[PDB]
């Protein structure tokens, strides 16, 4: 899984 | 008045997990201003609203269209009929989810940002809605979703390489966020790669200089370009 | 028209996570028979649905109650009105969850069910139900959902003990549900252990003689009453 | 946490 920002 | 009362119940719906509400909340606090911008604790929450309401339909989107691909290759044309029906209706949420977010930031929390660090934080997002949008959408629409991600990730580009230091949580946010969509939208590895490094080098380089809670909270970013330059690699 | 594609619309919305949804298909399959019952894999579906709506209201309740508790003892009155108004919004919903499977089971799956496992099933469920309005409602009605829910379950036992085995997953479900009413409602700790102790033993004593999925089937609730037998001693 | 029944 590749991730993003929590914001 | 001051009703901080909704931003309050906002944090409740955060507890409760009631994600739509606490949107509902903190986007009556964003309608409520004159010339005042969001704190950085509001606007935070409203972006941990938003995330939270479209990352359920976006999680949906994803085991739906499995399905659907499952399905084609077995030619069970009659289960395709539905599950195309299914994600239609998925894709209305998610088409609705952004734009309710989309024009907030047009109309609003852009064009009455102040700080670098806002102008950032909101460029960014619009970046980010956009970017959900072109996840699914197909044609013009995905056309029109990449171009408008592709400038306001610049615009917030620019204003973060000026008055933001590489270490500062949303500047390392945007990075990871921009090589995201370089990587997933534009299929562009070697940018993605590129921008995830120089952003990571970058903020180890200037790094052991700032309080205890900083190093905590950009370290946990810095952490996710790690995870993802790793699983690139 | 079999519209089965109800039952496959259920499956899809179980995998997307939507669980208001997946009660819907599984209601208007339910409303749709005239002399017929619900199959197992529908009765469960539906079971699924309704637990997964209702979970994330108790799931919510549960924290908003924690926070008032905690909020009233530091005397911050006003957070106490605020989280109040909240318990009393997740509180509708709850009462409107248990409402529509209540009156499904008492117009619809009780009346009409045949077999033994069925009717066990349908009365535990409305035990169930009942269960969840005694874990919030307050005076009378707390009173009248607690007698309900002992009428339920123990209807549900007499036919249970005659007309299915000890291993019954549906007869170990039933002791599990109804050890649980005299422990957190009733608020007999005694009258608990004892009834999931003995349908424990009762369910070991007869157990080496299934095939190896029925195994699977019951070792797995019969896990769930040594979980709760450990945690109460 | 206590544990009921799956269905």
């Given at each position: 899984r590749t991730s993003t920002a929590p914001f | 008045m001051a009703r901080e009362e909704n931003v309050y119940m906002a944090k409740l719906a955060e507890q409760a997990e009631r994600y739509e509400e606490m949107?509902?909340?903190?986007?009556?606090?964003?309608?409520?201003?004159?010339?005042?911008?969001?704190?950085?604790?509001?606007?935070?929450?409203?972006?941990?609203?938003?995330?939270?309401?479209?990352?359920?339909?976006?999680?949906?989107?994803?085991?739906?269209?499995?399905?659907?691909?499952?399905?084609?290759?077995?030619?069970?044309?009659?289960?395709?009929?539905?599950?195309?029906?299914?994600?239609?209706?998925?894709?209305?949420?998610?088409?609705?989810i952004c734009d309710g977010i989309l024009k907030l930031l047009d109309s609003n929390l852009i064009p009455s940002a102040s700080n670098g660090?806002?102008?950032?934080?909101?460029?960014?997002?619009?970046?980010?809605?956009?970017?959900?949008?072109?996840?699914?959408?197909?044609?013009?629409?995905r056309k029109e979703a990449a171009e408008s991600t592709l400038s306001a990730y610049k615009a917030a580009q620019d204003i973060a390489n000026?008055?933001?230091?590489?270490?500062?949580?949303?500047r390392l946010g945007l990075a990871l966020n921009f090589s995201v969509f370089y990587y997933e939208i534009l299929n562009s590895p070697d940018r993605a790669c590129n921008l995830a490094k120089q952003a990571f080098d970058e903020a180890i380089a200037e790094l052991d200089t700032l309080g205890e809670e900083s190093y905590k909270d950009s370290t946990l970013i810095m952490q996710l370009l790690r995870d993802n330059l790793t699983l690139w690699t």
């Open positions: - | 949107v509902q909340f903190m986007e009556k606090v964003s309608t409520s201003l004159g010339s005042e911008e969001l704190t950085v604790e509001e606007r935070n929450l409203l972006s941990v609203a938003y995330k939270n309401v479209i990352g359920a339909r976006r999680a949906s989107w994803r085991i739906i269209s499995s399905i659907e691909q499952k399905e084609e290759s077995r030619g069970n044309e009659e289960h395709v009929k539905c599950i195309k029906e299914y994600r239609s209706k998925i894709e209305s949420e998610l088409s609705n660090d806002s102008k950032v934080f909101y460029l960014k997002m619009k970046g980010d809605y956009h970017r959900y949008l072109a996840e699914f959408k197909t044609g013009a629409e000026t008055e933001l230091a590489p270490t500062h949580p949303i």
